Amino acid sequence: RSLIVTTILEEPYVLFKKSDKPLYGNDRFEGYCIDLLRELSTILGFTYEIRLVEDGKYGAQDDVNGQWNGMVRELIDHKADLAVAPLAITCVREKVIDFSKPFMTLGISILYRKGTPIDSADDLAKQTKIEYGAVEDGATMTFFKKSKISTYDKMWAFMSSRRQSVLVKSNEEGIQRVLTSDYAFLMESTTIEFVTQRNCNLTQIGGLIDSKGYGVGTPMGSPYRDKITIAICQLQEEGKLHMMKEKWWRGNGCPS
């Protein structure tokens, strides 16, 4: 039996492979998470079918009714066996789904343009001329919501009282807003690293604000979770996780 693997389109983790002819099935995707998924299947010996989350969402809990959406809800309802995606392992998701050990470490940081007085979230928090936000219903947005730290709680009051105007639906939308307006985008440092190598005008501002991991998600209590953690340890041991990251982030396009 074939495991259903739910994912989401996000460069350079998961993308449509470019070719002159129609591609079908798993063959039509490529990226870091497609390579990882492939290495996992050959270690653990399963077959799989990749499907993109119908929602287009990562997975947040809505306050009004306590229900999840996105990739998390797909695993909650057992419509997927695994989620191989840049899905952040967070405490609020660990209550409803299970994660393998992280296959990559990252943090929330700020994507903005080179050449400004802003050099930390602290500088953003204390003003309102430069708008900022994050992907709505992602892990970054939940960081700000739960923090009892002045700077981050103040950034959440700002974003919160301007939801319909400063929260974006995807990273690409946030990236487009940084490039076309006075807007700073809170997003994950791994993605920022990929993005600032293709746009020399963009830069990560300040350091990492938190620290987290991407792990493969599974429904709560499933037995593949421990198998997958052991496969990830082996790939880490062998340097393959590292090789996969140089391959997908290879692009000495801009100066660092």
Ligand X SMILES: N[C@@H](CCC(=O)O)C(=O)O
The residue whose two tokens read 């993308």 is: 15
> CB atoms < 10 A from the CB of 90, how many?
19
The answer to whether 185 and 133 are in contact (CB under 8 A) is yes
CA 51, CA 88: separation in Å to the nearest integer? 19
Tell me: does residue 210 bind its own copies (CB under 8 A): yes
Q: Which stretch binds ligand X (CB under 6 A): 130-138, 202-210, 234-242, 245-253?
A: 130-138
Structure token digits, residue 18: 């470019």
Structure token digits, residue 207: 């350091």
Tell me: does residue 242 bind its own copies (CB under 8 A): yes
- When the beta carbons of 135 and 175 are compared against ligand X, the nearer one is 135
**H/E stretch holding 170:** none
Tell me: does residue 139 bind ligand X (CB under 6 A): yes
Q: Which stretch binds ligand X (CB under 6 A): 34-42, 111-119, 136-144, 225-233?
A: 136-144
3-state secondary structure of 109: strand
Q: Which stretch binds its own copies (CB under 8 A): 66-74, 75-83, 217-225, 232-240?
A: 232-240
CA 157, CA 145: separation in Å to the nearest integer? 9
- The contact set with ligand X (CB under 6 A) reads 58, 86-88, 134-135, 138-140, 187-188
**Which residues are part of a known binding site for L-glutamate?**
86, 88, 93, 139-140, 188
**Which residues are part of a known binding site?**
86, 88, 93, 139-140, 188
